[PDB]
Design an enzyme around this catalytic site. Sequence first.
Site, PDB file in Angstrom:
ATOM      1  N   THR A  62      -2.011   0.048  13.054  1.00  0.00           N
ATOM      2  CA  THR A  62      -2.246   0.335  11.604  1.00  0.00           C
ATOM      3  C   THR A  62      -2.366  -0.955  10.797  1.00  0.00           C
ATOM      4  OG1 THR A  62      -1.073   2.471  11.653  1.00  0.00           O
ATOM      5  CG2 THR A  62      -1.306   1.408   9.495  1.00  0.00           C
ATOM      6  N   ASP A 110      -6.933   1.309   7.405  1.00  0.00           N
ATOM      7  CA  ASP A 110      -7.814   1.727   8.489  1.00  0.00           C
ATOM      8  C   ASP A 110      -7.564   3.207   8.776  1.00  0.00           C
ATOM      9  OD1 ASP A 110      -5.255   1.289   9.870  1.00  0.00           O
ATOM     10  OD2 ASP A 110      -6.442   1.597  11.694  1.00  0.00           O
ATOM     11  N   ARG A 125      -7.196   4.674  12.200  1.00  0.00           N
ATOM     12  CA  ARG A 125      -6.821   4.920  13.601  1.00  0.00           C
ATOM     13  C   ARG A 125      -5.328   5.220  13.733  1.00  0.00           C
ATOM     14  NH1 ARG A 125      -8.093   0.513  18.366  1.00  0.00           N
ATOM     15  NH2 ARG A 125     -10.189   1.407  18.102  1.00  0.00           N
ATOM     16  N   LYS A 185      -4.525   7.636   5.931  1.00  0.00           N
ATOM     17  CA  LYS A 185      -3.256   6.924   5.730  1.00  0.00           C
ATOM     18  C   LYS A 185      -2.920   6.662   4.261  1.00  0.00           C
ATOM     19  CE  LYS A 185      -3.934   4.650  10.168  1.00  0.00           C
ATOM     20  NZ  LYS A 185      -3.598   3.455  10.985  1.00  0.00           N
ATOM     21  N   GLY A 218       3.869   2.793  10.664  1.00  0.00           N
ATOM     22  CA  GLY A 218       5.041   3.145  11.465  1.00  0.00           C
ATOM     23  C   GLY A 218       4.952   4.578  11.952  1.00  0.00           C
ATOM     24  N   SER A 263       0.785  -3.174  12.233  1.00  0.00           N
ATOM     25  CA  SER A 263       0.504  -4.035  13.390  1.00  0.00           C
ATOM     26  C   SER A 263      -0.606  -5.055  13.112  1.00  0.00           C
ATOM     27  CB  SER A 263       0.139  -3.189  14.613  1.00  0.00           C
ATOM     28  OG  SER A 263      -0.960  -2.338  14.337  1.00  0.00           O
ATOM     29  N   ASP A 299      -6.989  -6.390  15.733  1.00  0.00           N
ATOM     30  CA  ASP A 299      -5.776  -5.679  16.164  1.00  0.00           C
ATOM     31  C   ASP A 299      -6.136  -4.392  16.902  1.00  0.00           C
ATOM     32  OD1 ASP A 299      -3.008  -4.933  16.367  1.00  0.00           O
ATOM     33  OD2 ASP A 299      -3.291  -3.615  14.635  1.00  0.00           O
ATOM     34  N   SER A 310      -5.316  -0.971  15.302  1.00  0.00           N
ATOM     35  CA  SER A 310      -6.137  -0.530  14.176  1.00  0.00           C
ATOM     36  C   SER A 310      -7.599  -0.383  14.586  1.00  0.00           C
ATOM     37  CB  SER A 310      -6.027  -1.535  13.033  1.00  0.00           C
ATOM     38  OG  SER A 310      -4.671  -1.846  12.765  1.00  0.00           O
TER      39      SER A 310
HETATM   40 MG   LIG Z   1     -11.586   0.366  21.992  1.00  0.00          MG
END
Ligand SMILES: [Mg+2]
Lengths: 226, 195, 195, 204, 196, 196, 212, 222, 125, 233
Positions: free
Chosen positions: A1, A17, A19, A33, A47, A129, A166, A169
């Site tokens: 995230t 993001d 994901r 989110k 989290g 993250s 990352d 994300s």
């Molecule tokens: Mg991939």
Amino acid sequence: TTIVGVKFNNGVVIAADTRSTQGPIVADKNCAKLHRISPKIWCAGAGTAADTEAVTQLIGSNIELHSLYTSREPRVVSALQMLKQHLFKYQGHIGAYLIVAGVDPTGSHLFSIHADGSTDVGYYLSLGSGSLAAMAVLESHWKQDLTKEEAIKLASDAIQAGIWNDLGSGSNVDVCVMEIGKDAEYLRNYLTPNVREEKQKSYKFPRGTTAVLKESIVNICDIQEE
Amino acid sequence: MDIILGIRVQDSVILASSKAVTRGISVLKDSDDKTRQLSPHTLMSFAGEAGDTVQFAEYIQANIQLYSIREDYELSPQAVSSFVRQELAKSIRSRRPYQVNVLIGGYDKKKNKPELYQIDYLGTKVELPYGAHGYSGFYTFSLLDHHYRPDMTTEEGLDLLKLCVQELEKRMPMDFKGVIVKIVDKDGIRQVDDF
Amino acid sequence: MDIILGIRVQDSVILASSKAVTRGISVLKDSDDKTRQLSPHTLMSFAGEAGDTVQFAEYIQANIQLYSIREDYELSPQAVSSFVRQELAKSIRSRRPYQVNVLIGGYDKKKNKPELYQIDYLGTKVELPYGAHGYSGFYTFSLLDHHYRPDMTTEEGLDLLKLCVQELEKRMPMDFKGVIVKIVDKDGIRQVDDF
Amino acid sequence: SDPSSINGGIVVAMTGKDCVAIACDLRLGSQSLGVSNKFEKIFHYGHVFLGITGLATDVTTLNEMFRYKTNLYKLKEERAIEPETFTQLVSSSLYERRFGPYFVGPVVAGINSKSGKPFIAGFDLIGCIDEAKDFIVSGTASDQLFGMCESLYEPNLEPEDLFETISQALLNAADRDALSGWGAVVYIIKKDEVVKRYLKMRQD
Amino acid sequence: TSIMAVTFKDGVILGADSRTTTGAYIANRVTDKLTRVHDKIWCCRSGSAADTQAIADIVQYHLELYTSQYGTPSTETAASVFKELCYENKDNLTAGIIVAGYDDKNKGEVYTIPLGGSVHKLPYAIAGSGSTFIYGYCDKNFRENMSKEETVDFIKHSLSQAIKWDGSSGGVIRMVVLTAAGVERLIFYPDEYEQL
Amino acid sequence: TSIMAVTFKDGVILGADSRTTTGAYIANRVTDKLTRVHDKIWCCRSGSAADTQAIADIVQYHLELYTSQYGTPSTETAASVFKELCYENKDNLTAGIIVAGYDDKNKGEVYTIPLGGSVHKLPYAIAGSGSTFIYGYCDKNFRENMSKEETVDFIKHSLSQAIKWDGSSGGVIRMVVLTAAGVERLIFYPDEYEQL
Amino acid sequence: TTTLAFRFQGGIIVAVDSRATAGNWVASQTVKKVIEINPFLLGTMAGGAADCQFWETWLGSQCRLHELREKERISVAAASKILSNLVYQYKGAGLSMGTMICGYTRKEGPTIYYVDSDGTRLKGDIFCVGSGQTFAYGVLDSNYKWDLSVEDALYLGKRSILAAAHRDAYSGGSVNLYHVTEDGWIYHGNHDVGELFWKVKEEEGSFNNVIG
Amino acid sequence: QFNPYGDNGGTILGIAGEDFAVLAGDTRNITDYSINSRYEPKVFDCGDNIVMSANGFAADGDALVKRFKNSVKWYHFDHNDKKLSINSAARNIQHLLYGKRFFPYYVHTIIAGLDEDGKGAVYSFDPVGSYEREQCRAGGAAASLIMPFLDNQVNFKNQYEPGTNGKVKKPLKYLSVEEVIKLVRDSFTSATERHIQVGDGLEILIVTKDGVRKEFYELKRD
Amino acid sequence: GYDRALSIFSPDGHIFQVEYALEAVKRGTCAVGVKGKNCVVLGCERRSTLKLQDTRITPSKVSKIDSHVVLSFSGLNADSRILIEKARVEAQSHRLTLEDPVTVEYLTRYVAGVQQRYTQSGGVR
Amino acid sequence: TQQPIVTGTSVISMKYDNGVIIAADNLGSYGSLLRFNGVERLIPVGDNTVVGISGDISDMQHIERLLKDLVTENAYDNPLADAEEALEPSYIFEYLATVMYQRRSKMNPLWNAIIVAGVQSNGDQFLRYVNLLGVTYSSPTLATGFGAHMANPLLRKVVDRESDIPKTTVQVAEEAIVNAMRVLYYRDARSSRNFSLAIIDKNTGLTFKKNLQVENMKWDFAKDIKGYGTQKI
Ligand SMILES: [Mg+2]
Ligand SMILES: [Mg+2]
Ligand SMILES: [Mg+2]
């Protein structure tokens, strides 16, 4: 995230993001989110995904009742104070990491909350993250007296840094702009830089491919008359 | 305790349960009856941690006997099994859970059908033609899968049960001192005194 | 493995050893002979960790057979037992010790006396009228203490041994699938094929 | 030891043109030991369907719980619960056990009776809603199901085409999982008819 | 953290760095560790940010309610309310707080409250991870009844060294001056204090 | 321990406290932590007494054998022999050594060897548990090319503070002066340095 | 895993499943659990895949060296003991094996030795090893006779693996059959369990619990 | 405590055709949630018409490939430049792996090529050296996402012929090199969507009687 | 909780609430019990003011407490259900702990004890 | 097996059209104590290679001595030691990579992450990573420790793939590196303001820049930040 928040001239912007993951597996490719606490107070969560929405809706519910009781539009410091005291009580076990932003009769505000109930104030913030990838972009390009257009650009650029660099994300960028004296505009899928390419082959099967043992009509209707 | 088996045939349910009770080093008893009659047409066998097994079985028995008196009516095997499951499903998240696995064999007088329910200590219920708990299934299920028919007689069910017990006595390391066998049918519950 | 017994009577030594071999869940064999002939008038039974038991027993057997050929002479039971003890006493402080307990039954042709030696995996040797390893003694020693006489015949020794095995079959939790019985006397070693 | 993979099993749901499909295997086990080949994991309350994977005692408990709650809902509201509303009820009910949760992976599927819009949703054991347009997966072969669905799925499939897609997704995923299989069921759901099909598959 | 409070002729000054840490990552480089529990009673926070924020908010609530009933509280009273929370919840807290205030009767006062929850009234106090490196410097350089300018220099130089050696400390040096004249905030940037 | 070595105009001076510890019990209050590995190459010892004594004895042996073959070794050479032992046996040692020496060509030099076994050439060095409390003081007060009297005062004041705050340090302050003139031992008692 | 081997009038039957798993994930359905040591000797594979493969092909090399030096076929007793003595040297190091060394010689006749990584070496008539061993034992014990025909013995081994494959989650894929004679082993094909189950259900009338 | 192992992610796939063989693998290298490289070659030409990939812990993977390439070199020196057959290479790799049985190469190895009859061949290894010849084999992170799809689309599992309803299986007709590559690309495209460690690029090495050819395709970089 | 002392003594030493409870019994339908040499019979009156009654489902006047003990009553019908329920629970509790069914005297003593408790407990009639 | 004692933080690097750039700060940390402020962590080998090292400093000094010995050894009986048979970046890396993997295989690692940057004989850019585990990889941008999380995202915006390398000048590349070092100073608690930077160009050779400082820092906005939520003064 990856989630960010950026202050500007006449308000504040937050982004995220889209994901959500179960370990190394992507559970949802277009997750939402950016949560609404009140019409002009929004927050982004990282989290434990259940905790971030649960804690947002509880405080959002109490904020609405408070707004009705006091005949006043809700304040960000009210949402902040209620969130931190809730999270501190549970000593970090409610894994909610939030960036809280909004506008109220006092002005525009931007805070972050940690799971243990620790808070901080800032002009630019990042969590999750991909926060280090995002913060790198924010530390490189942030300045004082940003315009609305500049802040949206900076926020989405910070989320992109998270998306690309990352593994936690990915997918799309969601944005929410909260300007003073205006309705908050929620820009769902503001950027879409990760559309899947057409597949090489169609995998539609011929009808009758699957072996079947029994067929039956399921009665979803209620008990009938006559 | 150790081995408990169950098999549902045409017109009855048969439960087989070991007789041994072991306190670690020694076998304290070789004639123990690991079962309780819940109602005239419903029998429950059990196996698990010492003390908890009997305490649970008798607690269930009392509750079903209470229901029978209050309503002047015998609950169906399905209804009893659901009650038992809920009690175990309640138990698993308690301070100290009942460590008890059970088989419920009953004859439904309304539908005129025998019924066998297998419930483990977690509250996991399944209706089966034949069932077991612990390691008992590992030895016996390959034989039951082969020989079992839904239209078996009670005598054929007992013969298939003997073959299962023989395999257990051959390949199991523990001496469970034979089994007490009980039959549940339209006429009620009776014990096969020679097995 | 599990149960190994030994009894020294007037003119012979009798060793009894279980037949079962268990790999955790299943009983892989029910006819296993847990013994090796070290010399014409010396027999050794054994029990301990899997693999180590046979590996040790055969290693001892080879060494005693080597001695017999080199000297054209059979070592006394006392001499053999001392050799075995030293090997186990050496083993206990090794990198990976032999986890093997043994009974050595032999007939000394010089003194015309039967002799029974009990040696555990640590290298603890004792000469006894009757002995055992593991939990076997716990069940059988109270019977042997009562009935044993130094002037018993071989047939009386076998009857007292049957009473011991019956008690084991009654009170032990594990099914050891009966015992193979062997007699050691002046004429050598023979197996009792019906027990 | 791990509660979510003691009993085993899988559920998958998909959307199509004016229809939804939900499917599950029939296995119940005690780790390696297969216990039952008739343990259905899909339940329905009115026109709203709920699949549940995970610890079997909780699967049974939750079914009984939502039957309880949807029945009281119907008496008071004087109408059957809708998929969107039911989804929120599942989420609420799971989160109230935040620090002592039901070890399950629920999946909701159904068509809104008023708008006619196809709907599906998934949850983690603790209540988080995953409401996807395309497909939802759950159980001990969820990884395998993600792989099948991601390649086999295309949007706006007709009911009889959608049946073949979801069936092949489940079957081939289940055959690569030790704790899934032993039979399978597929529900095809339209606005006012629902067809239930049992599939023939390998029994190992 | 590197935090300190120093009494001087006209009152008391609180000083602090601005770094907040989660491991080696600086989660906030512009943190405000100097916190207000009453008009002229402030505190310096070290340890868990959550704990010290929760404590400071409760103390502010207690002193606001005290003021409504009994008028302005003493600095000693404020320190006692801090102590009561820190001592009675010692098992569940990680907080090292310095309390500093200005009365007209008592003038500038400083109370330090370490982990245990004990109270120690001192002429000046130092705390936080970075304080270890300046015990020597501060002991040699502190004098009683300094001027405002001397005290600012003492704190600036002291925290400069603490920041230089402690990786956990850094950023800007914040200060808050408490005198009869009122409440003054000061800030000093890296380019200023690093060349000292 | 509190130990330090400081280069100055005429050479180098080593300084140390005299406390040795086994727990809270002071096993020796008059310890000599300044040790000779060659005529004008000495070292300061901190950490395990056994380890630093074993190491110092081996180094002395190596430099004695070096001298018999190749003449007087450099301070750099001595530091390298120390390093070789500390680095190659890092898993089994707990030693923090400062090496100080005087050449005529190179004059006063100081090398510090921390736990890892790394070498660092410095104008001055501090080490031991008590050094943490004087990083600030020493950084502010050190100058290059000090006189003998200034350097003695710098070390005396520095170790005085280290002793004041560190329970592990204490007793007398020993010093060893290394110059062209020779080797001078100095001692300073509590009544002298405590009142500083 | 389910592997079995039994002695009878016509020699030895060896039957195995084909499944390999890493946790719940089914890695392979086409694993070869009968090691062809040489044209006369077979070994089964349970426990460690590599340990069984590596050391039983190594065993084949030792058996080849034996018959070159001694100008005579190695006995099953000698071949099994070379393997058991080898793994006994590694005892404690963490080898994982449960195998049946199967052969048919003049002096011995049909012989089976169960060999274990903790050193065990047992001669026997019927052996069954793996996570599904208990299921296969049940079918074997109740149907085994010495005077079985080659056709009936092959079926018994096939049916016993099927029993295990059905119930044991970690057994399945396909059945591999072998018949060991004095002149060498004969391969009797790969049989998919999916297809075999339905075929057996219909023809035999078994598995009435399962709908087909 | 020191941990000598790590996980560099990645996913590989080997498919054997009638007269060809492919060995594919993504080019992404990772630790935890960070990307090390978006293009780090993982499949290697080892000479003698053999391609190899050792997926998992990259240090052990690189060590093993290096040692096998070396083994091919010394096979030529010691045996008069004889071509190392794919079956011989496989057995040799077993001995390389089992050589470290008690401190293993933490990798899942796959090799591909042609057998001595000119037919396509793939071999699969576990970390300690057990190996099988196989028709279709995915390895690494997203192996569980890919294999079920291949069972269905290569081996036609659970697919029956329309009208018969389960009675007649769909016939196992042979796939061309163009058809296989389509399935490889769709496998990795799908894996990229659902596995965080899979992406950036896809490199495929095709092996025919004519030699070894390469093909590269972009993958999503998020 | 409601703690009011409803059952209390009067100047003449009477507890009127207990005595008025007896008047409710006087109003109830007649019940009779007769024991023979090897049996007991319980007779009960049904007032015929209520016809169009469903006698299949209407609560019967005699109630089994266990398989071997019965209970009939006169007075308030709703009150009797509470005593019958408590008695049935206690009967099963006795079987569970003593491993023997209640004696008729024990069951009577229990019910009588419950009735007494409600004459000197606060907040209850 | 050991634990690192005196440690060095991030090393960052990237490729550009004519060569490579590498940078690392001059700090030797002792836990949270910023103990040694004059440590050089970029070590040049010849005029075509620079090895940048993070992690345990004692192990860095050992590696430094190995490289020094490597140059000496290469010169022995080598008339072309300063020409055709000079040490290449690829030779120096492969040697280190061998040592690192051998040391991890004896369960006694050199507790480091290393980046070898240089230019080959034919002018090709060389940039490759190796660490205590013996793991290796190459990329247009490479960074260790914190640099991996914060520097790479910034450097990848300049050179995202291979085709972006010829389009990137040395001025643009150095600018990006210097900015990354500033960001690391803002956010890494074990970093310092002082750092070294090295450029290896196929035309202008090796330029080694010592005693650089992070400048143009933004701190002024700190004055407006008050409290942690509700505080106004
Ligand atoms: Mg991939
Ligand atoms: Mg700092
Ligand atoms: Mg199976």
